[PDB]
Design a protein around this ligand. Structure first.
Ligand SMILES: CCCCC/C=C/C/C=C/C/C=C\C/C=C\CCCC(=O)O[C@H](COC(=O)CCCCCCCCCCCCCCCCC)COP(=O)(O)O[C@@H]1[C@H](O)[C@H](O)[C@@H](OP(=O)(O)O)[C@H](OP(=O)(O)O)[C@H]1O
Ligand SMILES: *[C@@H]1O[C@H](CO)[C@@H](O[C@@H]2O[C@H](CO)[C@@H](O[C@@H]3O[C@H](CO)[C@@H](O[C@@H]4O[C@H](CO)[C@@H](O)[C@H](O)[C@H]4NC(C)=O)[C@H](O)[C@H]3NC(C)=O)[C@H](O)[C@H]2NC(C)=O)[C@H](O)[C@H]1NC(C)=O
Ligand SMILES: CCCCCCCCCCCCCCCCCC(=O)OC[C@H](COP(=O)(O)OCCN)OC(=O)CCCCCCCCCCCCCCCCC
Ligand SMILES: *[C@@H]1O[C@H](CO)[C@@H](O[C@@H]2O[C@H](CO)[C@@H](O[C@@H]3O[C@H](CO)[C@@H](O)[C@H](O)[C@H]3NC(C)=O)[C@H](O)[C@H]2NC(C)=O)[C@H](O)[C@H]1NC(C)=O
Ligand SMILES: *[C@@H]1O[C@H](CO)[C@@H](O[C@@H]2O[C@H](CO)[C@@H](O)[C@H](O)[C@H]2NC(C)=O)[C@H](O)[C@H]1NC(C)=O
Ligand SMILES: CC(C)CCC[C@@H](C)[C@H]1CC[C@H]2[C@@H]3CC=C4C[C@@H](O)CC[C@]4(C)[C@H]3CC[C@]12C
Ligand SMILES: CC(C)CCC[C@@H](C)[C@H]1CC[C@H]2[C@@H]3CC=C4C[C@@H](O)CC[C@]4(C)[C@H]3CC[C@]12C
Ligand SMILES: *[C@@H]1O[C@H](CO)[C@@H](O)[C@H](O)[C@H]1NC(C)=O
Ligand SMILES: *[C@@H]1O[C@H](CO)[C@@H](O)[C@H](O)[C@H]1NC(C)=O
Ligand SMILES: [Ca+2]
Ligand SMILES: [Ca+2]
Lengths: 23, 223, 424, 6, 195, 195, 113
């Protein structure tokens, strides 16, 4: 029986910070 | 590296078909005007024929991809085209016949020194320091150097190492004097004055330091 | 609650090192840093010499102290020693209380000297990775095409084997490979648990892969998404991530990323491994459209630091949850780093809340500052279950919601085995 | 376990 | 000689800067070995004749050195750990793995170091271009210059491969053409003397 | 002002070289317009030195713009004005020969540019052949990247040029030998390419 | 000393080089030209002597570490060895590495004080 809590897919997340955005 | 590819290579492999078609059409048209004794026309013919061979073999087998090194000979057709470059190419390889009594002396010197270094250094560079524990590795640092057993006058191993036989060679076994194939190349490389001190020092660390310099100094002074 | 209020009231000193921050480096026996010398009495509750006057700091050998990032953290993580010194009085049985910071330095309570080469990083420990993010369903994609042969494939086989070490028993993993044909590297063929035995099969089949053939990103990515939609097997039903190991390419696979990842439920982390000259532009696009990150591993020394930072992206939804994410989580039974036997560890992540009331948050406040842990020894849990009254054949035992025992008279303080021993 | 070789 | 075994006390350099001046003994045989004086005079006439080539070669090497200073000043710096691209980021220790073995860690210090030959000032550029024109160690400098991208920053693999045109032009002009003009000048002058 | 630029210069030096590089360009342009006027256009563009000087001044004018508009980094353009130091030779007799040498070099251009064309063709042919022979086969497990490979056209051109200069020509052959096996019979027949 | 006489048989090969004009004319003419100018080749000997002595006096005491370019094989500690070093530099064989290894700031030899 795995953990009951789950924390993913929030709509306030940034999404603007990859590793190639700098260049 | 390992049969990988991209889209550009796949497009060039199909442009090659058009280039071969053009060259074959040229070959056939020129063949039916004359019924070819020229050297350049022979080069064109043997280029187009091997190109057809390569294409057919590649289609059949779906090394084949090694005889495609006849297409690096196509840029030679530029000399054939412009006649102001044929003159210069003839001026280049016409003063080479005089440099044929100095290409035979070089051949004699290389042979003589390769036989002398084969009667002197044959198999003397196949041992190195190996630690006294779990070995088969050469603890002689990143670049191992030949040593000598504690009876000769070569390099002696360090305080915590032992000179043991069973070693490949100074440069993976390419720089040696083991036969008249490995010596003929070492002598040539020393004659070109590149990496000759490396060979001299490797011999110095294997047989001693008194005599070996007479070989490598006279070899460069004469050759 | 006293490590988040103090940090919120911290002024970022860039070159105020002349203020001489004072601490005690654990591994010693400097510009801007003093050094405390403790008394080091010997205690029986622990097995070492511990002083109750301050908290020791462990800075990894690869992390240079006296830096602007490090010196700032040794300044604001100094009010902890007052609340570290306060938890003990209520319960004098408190063991190691540790704050594992995201910079790499941990500050543990029992001021005690650290334990050849010290390859310890607080960000890789099981009690830190457990609290830094929720469980996951990572599927690893390995490029075994022709262009990766040589040194690049050597760094890929190590990188895949080093990320698997960042997986717990609540996470499910599987490793695939594409060389113009998509296939698994092992006998599993679906998502399996990441326990000790299954992790050894996956990292032994990784060490036996050969690089040959053309590359096809579209065929290898359909095999990845289709393996995360199984739902026949037991899964974690949590963060679904795809981690692609490769060098470079010229294909973005836009069609595949819209046939499957239209709602952006799967995160794609892309790693560019090795020293080469290839277009990494398409690789960075996959990690940006899909809510992931892009990493570069050019040498062996970059493997350890780059295979653990994918947890800063998985913790973003957890930070924004708020006080609902403040749940104490106890880890599996493991041997303590500072030679204390078999212990379990609590866990509570701390958040960056600078500028909470005044609306300037969510700039960098989507990341956790660190994970705080507290150790409970199994000899303490063995003291609330007396045995000398039942019989010689009677005993107590307790298990997790996984089957693994936490307390049992057959569990010995020694690591469990996974296969026959081999040595060259 | 005894140190079995490879 | 004389004013030396008389110092008989002043180690103060002096002796050790008067001893390296005995090396002139061989040169006192020039005047007493007619035939050896003639070759010295001939070589002096030859070096007086070949002055234009040397002057216009030094003038060109100076301009090439200035161009190299413009292109590579403060750019060919490297940290021992190939992950730090700033001097302030290149302090402390780092772990290097011997023989590419992940199970053989070794701690080594981090050092911000320049190239062996660097285009920082004009004299260092002159020296580097001289050792490039002697065809010694020039591939190392070429591939260290290819990686350089920014001042006060570390190298980047194959950043500007096109910068090799500078070195190729330098070898073409100052190592293939100007060092053959000098030999042709010597041959022509000797032919004129013989004719 | 061109030769006094080093790395990490003081703040006053970079302003001195920024105001002098303009105050001297202005004077050279004034001399340009005076040359056009007092002599005439054709009498200006007769002499060879008078066409190179116009090239240098127009280059300076067009390169100040790129620097001030932050498009490209300085490469060295005003350094070609130091070629005008050759005018010192006009006071001595080492100017007739220097001018005559340049005159002969300019008269023989269809020969120089034709002799260099076969050298370029030789390098290109032996670059494509070497790239076919050793393309991607220099991928050894060891950590060294082996910067001198035959992987692309620019890299294979650099490798062939390095072999042509002769520096470390044996290190590339030791790598091409192990890329076809080792010190064995058929594999080692690849050294005929390098020889 | 048995090998000193094993190098005699290979020397018989020069008889084949002797036969045939071209080779035997070019070699003889150049040998007699080298013999006709024995003083032009003495300038090189004088230069080597002077520079070897100067290098012997200046860089003589540098410690011989085998991890550098001044090692047991390459050093200034004897006139034959200094002449060999100068010959190597004239050949143009990593001479700049020797120059950098002779830079100020090295360890002196244990024997020298
Ligand atoms: C040095 C050591 C040894 C070499 C072998 C022998 C020394 C003992 C010699 C006897 C030969 C002397 C006689 C002699 O004169 O030799 C020459 C050839 O000279 C070489 O090429 C000489 C070729 C030698 C090349 C040696 C290079 C081999 C490498 C050395 C290995 C040594 C390595 C040892 C390493 C030791 C490590 C421990 C043959 O005769 P010739 O060329 O002089 O010409 C004759 C004659 O001399 C007349 O003068 C000449 O008249 P003109 O030319 O008109 O003036 C006539 O010429 P033509 O008919 O063509 O018109 C001929 O009638
Ligand atoms: C929790 O979050 C808060 C903010 O939400 C964060 O506080 C912020 O810290 C940064 C430092 O990383 C401050 O940045 C200031 O402004 C610039 C931006 O970095 C700095 O100038 C240079 O920046 C470059 C990076 O591009 C850096 O490499 C360089 O060293 C910097 N200094 C130079 C070139 O001299 C400033 O130095 C820096 N400090 C100032 C201006 O005092 C933000 O201002 C901080 N924000 C707030 C609101 O205070 C905090 O660090 C987070 N917690 C942790 C543990 O990291
Ligand atoms: C035209 C211009 C030509 C210039 C000359 C060309 C180069 C000539 C080089 C001659 C010297 C070569 C170096 C040399 O002889 O090696 C040194 C070595 C010393 O050996 P050592 O350290 O004593 O160890 C003995 C191990 N059993 O050797 C010895 O053991 C000593 C050998 C003495 C050699 C004397 C000949 C030198 C002639 C110089 C002129
Ligand atoms: C990170 O930065 C500084 C490193 O020392 C600390 O700032 C100093 O803290 C001292 C301790 O409180 C202050 O001394 C006293 O401060 C109180 C509060 O204002 C007052 O009683 C006096 O100002 C002062 N007492 C004296 C001088 O007798 C320093 O004033 C203060 N300096 C500055 C520039 O802020 C930070 O506390 C430290 N962070 C943590 C968490 O320790
Ligand atoms: C198990 O997975 C399969 C596919 O991965 C699901 O779909 C089944 O596929 C099999 C094989 O073709 C067929 O029997 C049917 O197409 C599906 N079976 C059904 C609908 O009962 C399947 O739904 C998953 N679950 C189970 C319990 O089988
Ligand atoms: C006629 C012209 C070309 C003469 C050139 C000489 C002048 C401009 C150059 C030549 C070498 C230069 C020096 C080279 C190196 C350094 C070391 C450092 O402290 C910066 C200044 C300083 C000291 C430079 C100052 C300017 C300098 C002296
Ligand atoms: C003449 C100049 C221009 C180029 C010389 C190339 C030819 C003569 C040589 C150079 C490299 C050689 C190859 C080197 C190695 C191998 C691998 C093995 O299968 C034996 C043959 C083969 C394939 C050789 C065939 C002959 C070869 C192609
Ligand atoms: C710790 O738990 C024990 C168990 O009953 C009890 O003393 C109390 O709840 C705690 N002790 C404190 C808070 O001092
Ligand atoms: C070379 O010289 C000695 C020999 O061991 C030692 O100091 C070191 O290995 C080298 N020198 C330096 C300064 O590193
Ligand atoms: Ca690929
Ligand atoms: Ca060389």
């Amino acid at each position: 029986k795995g953990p009951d809590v789950c924390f993913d897919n929030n709509v306030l997340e940034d999404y603007t910070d990859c590793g190639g955005v700098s260049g | 590296p390992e049969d990988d590819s991209n889209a550009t290579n796949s497009n060039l492999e199909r442009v090659e078909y058009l280039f071969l078609i053009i060259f074959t059409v040229e070959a056939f048209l020129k063949v039916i005007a004359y019924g070819l004794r020229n050297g350049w026309n022979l080069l064109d013919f043997i280029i187009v024929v091997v190109g057809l061979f390569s294409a057919i073999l590649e289609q059949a087998t779906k090394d084949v991809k090694a005889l495609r090194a006849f297409r690096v000979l196509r840029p030679l057709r530029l000399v054939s085209g412009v006649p102001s470059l044929q003159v210069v190419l003839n001026s280049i390889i016409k003063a080479m016949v005089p440099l044929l009594h100095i290409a035979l002396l070089v051949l004699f010197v290389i042979i003589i020194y390769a036989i002398i270094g084969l009667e002197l250094f044959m198999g003397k560079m196949h041992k190195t320091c190996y630690n006294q524990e779990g070995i088969a590795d050469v603890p002689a640092e990143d670049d191992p150097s030949p040593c000598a057993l504690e009876t000769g006058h070569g390099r002696q191993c360090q305080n915590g190492t032992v000179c043991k036989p069973g070693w490949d060679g100074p440069k993976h076994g390419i720089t040696n004097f083991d036969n008249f194939a490995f010596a003929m190349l070492t002598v040539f490389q020393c004659i070109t004055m590149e990496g000759w001190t490396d060979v001299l020092y490797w011999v110095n660390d294997a047989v001693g330091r008194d005599w070996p310099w007479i070989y490598f100094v006279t070899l460069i002074i004469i050759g | 609650l006293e490590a988040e209020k103090v940090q919120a009231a911290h002024q970022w000193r860039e070159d105020f090192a002349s203020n001489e921050v004072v601490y005690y480096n654990a591994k010693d026996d400097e510009p801007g840093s003093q050094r405390i010398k403790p008394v080091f009495i010997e205690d029986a509750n622990f097995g070492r010499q511990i002083s109750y006057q301050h908290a020791a700091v462990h800075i990894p050998t690869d992390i240079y102290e006296g830096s602007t990032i490090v010196l700032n953290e040794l300044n604001w993580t100094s009010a902890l020693d007052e609340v570290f010194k306060k938890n003990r009085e209520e319960d004098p049985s408190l063991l190691w209380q540790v704050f594992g910071s995201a910079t790499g330095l941990a500050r543990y309570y029992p001021a005690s000297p650290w334990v050849k080469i010290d390859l310890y990083d607080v960000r890789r420990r099981p009690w830190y990775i457990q609290g830094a993010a929720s469980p996951k369903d990572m599927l690893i994609l390995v490029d075994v095409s022709g262009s990766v042969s040589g040194l690049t494939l050597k760094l890929i086989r190590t990188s895949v084997s080093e990320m698997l070490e960042t997986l717990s028993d609540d996470d499910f993993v599987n490793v695939a490979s594409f060389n113009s044909n998509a296939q698994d590297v092992s006998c599993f063929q679906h998502l399996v648990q990441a326990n000790v035995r299954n992790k050894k099969v996956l990292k032994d089949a990784v060490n036996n892969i050969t690089a040959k053939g053309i590359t096809d990103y579209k065929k290898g990515f359909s095999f990845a998404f289709e393996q995360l939609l199984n739902y026949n097997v037991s899964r974690a039903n949590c963060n679904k991530i795809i981690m692609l190991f490769t060098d470079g390419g010229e294909e973005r696979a836009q069609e595949i990323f819209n046939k499957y990842n239209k709602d952006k439920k799967v995160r794609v982390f892309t790693f560019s491994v090795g020293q080469h000259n290839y277009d990494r532009g398409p690789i960075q696009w996959m990690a940006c459209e899909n809510k992931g990150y892009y990493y570069e591993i050019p040498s062996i020394g970059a493997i350890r630091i780059n295979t653990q930072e994918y947890l800063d992206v998985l913790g973003r939804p957890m930070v924004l949850a708020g006080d609902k994410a403040k749940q104490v989580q106890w880890t599996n039974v493991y041997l303590d780093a500072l030679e204390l036997g078999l212990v379990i560890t609590g866990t509570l992540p701390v958040f960056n809340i600078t500028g909470q009331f005044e609306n300037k948050t969510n700039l960098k406040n989507q990341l956790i500052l660190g994970v705080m842990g507290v150790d409970v020894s199994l000899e303490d849990i063995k003291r609330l279950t007396p045995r000398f009254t039942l019989c010689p054949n009677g005993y107590y035992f307790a298990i997790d919601p996984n089957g693994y025992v936490l307390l049992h008279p057959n569990l010995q303080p020694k690591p469990i085995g996974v296969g026959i021993p081999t040595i060259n | 376990c005894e140190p079995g070789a490879a | 000689s004389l004013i030396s075994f008389g110092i008989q006390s002043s180690a103060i350099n002096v002796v050790k800067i008067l001893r390296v001046l005995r090396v002139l003994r061989p040169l006192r045989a020039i005047n007493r070995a007619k035939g050896l004086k003639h070759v010295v005079q001939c070589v002096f006439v030859a070096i007086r004749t070949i002055g234009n080539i040397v002057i216009v070669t030094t003038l060109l090497q100076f301009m090439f050195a200035c161009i190299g200073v413009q292109l590579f000043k403060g750019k060919l710096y490297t940290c021992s750990d190939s992950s730090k691209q700033t001097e302030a980021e290149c302090k402390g220790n780092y772990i290097t793995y011997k023989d590419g073995e992940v199970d053989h860690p070794i701690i080594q210090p981090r050092s911000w170091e320049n190239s062996k030959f660097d285009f920082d000032n004009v004299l260092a550029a002159m020296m580097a271009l001289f050792t490039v024109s002697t065809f010694e160690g020039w591939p190392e400098l070429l591939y260290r210059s290819i990686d350089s991208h920014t001042e006060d920053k570390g190298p980047i693999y194959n950043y500007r491969v096109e910068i090799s045109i500078f070195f190729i032009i330098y070898i073409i002009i100052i190592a293939f053409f100007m060092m053959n003009i000098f030999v042709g000048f010597v041959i022509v002058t000797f032919q004129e003397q013989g004719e | 002002t061109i030769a006094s630029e080093h790395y990490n210069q003081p703040n006053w030096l970079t302003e001195v070289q920024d105001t002098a590089n303009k105050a001297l360009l202005a004077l050279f342009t004034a001399e340009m317009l005076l040359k056009m006027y007092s002599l005439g256009l054709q009498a200006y563009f007769v002499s060879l030195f008078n066409r190179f000087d116009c090239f240098v001044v127009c280059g300076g004018i067009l390169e100040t713009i790129l620097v001030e508009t932050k498009i490209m980094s300085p490469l060295g353009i005003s350094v070609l004005r130091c070629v005008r130091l050759l005018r010192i030779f006009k006071i001595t007799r080492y100017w007739n020969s220097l001018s005559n040498l340049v005159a002969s070099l300019l008269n023989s251009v269809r020969s120089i540019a034709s002799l260099l064309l076969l050298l370029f063709l030789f390098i290109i042919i032996f670059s494509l052949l070497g790239m076919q022979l050793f393309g991607g086969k220099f991928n050894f497990d060891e950590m060294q990247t082996r910067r001198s490979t035959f992987d692309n056209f620019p890299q294979s051109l650099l490798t062939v040029f390095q072999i042509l200069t002769g520096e470390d020509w044996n290190s590339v052959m030791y790598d091409g030998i192990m890329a076809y096996g080792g010190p064995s019979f058929p594999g080692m027949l690849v050294c005929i390419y390098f020889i | 000393s048995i090998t000193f006489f094993r190098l005699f048989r290979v020397m018989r090969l020069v008889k084949l080089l002797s036969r045939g004009e071209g080779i035997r004319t070019l070699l003889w003419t150049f040998i007699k030209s080298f013999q006709a100018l024995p003083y032009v080749a003495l300038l090189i000997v004088m230069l080597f002597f002077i520079y070897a002595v100067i290098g012997m006096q200046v860089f003589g005491k540098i410690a011989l570490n085998d991890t550098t370019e001044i090692n047991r094989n390459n050093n200034f500690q004897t006139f034959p060895q200094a002449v060999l070093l100068l010959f190597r530099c004239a050949t143009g064989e990593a001479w700049q590495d020797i120059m950098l290894a002779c830079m100020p700031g090295k360890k002196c030899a244990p024997e020298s004080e």
